[PDB]
Symmetry: none
Subunit: 109 residues, 4 copies
Amino acid sequence: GMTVGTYAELASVFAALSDETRWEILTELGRADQSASSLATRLPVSRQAIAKHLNALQACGLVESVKVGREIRYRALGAELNKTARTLERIGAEWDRRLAAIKQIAESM
Amino acid sequence: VGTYAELASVFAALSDETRWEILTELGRADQSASSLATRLPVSRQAIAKHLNALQACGLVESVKVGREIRYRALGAELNKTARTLERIGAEWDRRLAAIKQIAESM
Amino acid sequence: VGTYAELASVFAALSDETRWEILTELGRADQSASSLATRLPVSRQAIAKHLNALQACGLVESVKVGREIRYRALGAELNKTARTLERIGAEWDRRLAAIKQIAESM
Amino acid sequence: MTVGTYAELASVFAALSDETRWEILTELGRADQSASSLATRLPVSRQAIAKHLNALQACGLVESVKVGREIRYRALGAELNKTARTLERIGAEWDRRLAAIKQIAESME
């Protein structure tokens, strides 16, 4: 389940989710659509850093822009968190099955 | 919660291709650090540094087997992380579905 | 949906400036095509054409008054139009509010 | 009922002067829809739908809603409400003036 293809496909998500500040942004954006200037007013992160985090989050599919008329807001999306979660379950299940084989053969008289 | 600090650490550990390679190895069989250094293009020292990061976030544990230390990959941490992401994603998905229904339903 | 053919005709009538100018003057008081010419900076040709359009969409009616024909603005037709827009507007504002109550923080 | 009222409302009156634009507004007031969606629903060409949408956006009766690959449109009540306020005022004034004339005529000897 760990193939290099999986890692290459999820690498940008893993990188995105490796930062506490990005989780802070995601949590905000999963609660209510917000502008970058809403986020800047809330968090101790500069407007330019927020822009960079938002671009990284949109590029890997964790955030989408929502532009209504002239107003630009952002929204967190579950699709990539769900995909990541399914992959981490499948890999966790294989490690578990593997561990069960080893425990079982340690018992063989 | 400390939940986001722990998520960030796990993804920081997974984000590195060398750690992914180590976990791929361990996935298939628990191994000593010397074994991993024999198999991979990094030094015994680099392996110990990666292993420390993998242990510190709960993805690997060391275990003394006879006269040697082995490392094992821990499914429980992948399952816990997955369950957290499923919770969070289900709420974002509920909200998206609600928005699209009121905004777009034909 | 008979409403929208009639809405469109009312707005087509209101959409021309010189026709607006005539209509406003009638709203002040009924008058003949003659008195409209005397009172307004407009041609007799334009009055004839716009009075026809205003009548054909129901915003004005002609009345025989002794030996003259006068034209009267029909505030009922404005009120019916305003009431229709207010209903429609209300139905669009409710959908907007609903979307908003889900999508953004109130 | 000033010529300033006309100057500002002129583009709205023009937009509302076409039954096809009313049909497009009715659809967009019930559901945000793409131009493609509208063309599936109405016997109007995509070119015509595009021109009408441009017209409706320019006077503020519709806004675009852009989320992903998707561009949709939404009817907004705001200009309808402003127009209705103005027509209601004008109608009420005509009624007042008519009543005042009736009293003048009754007092004529």
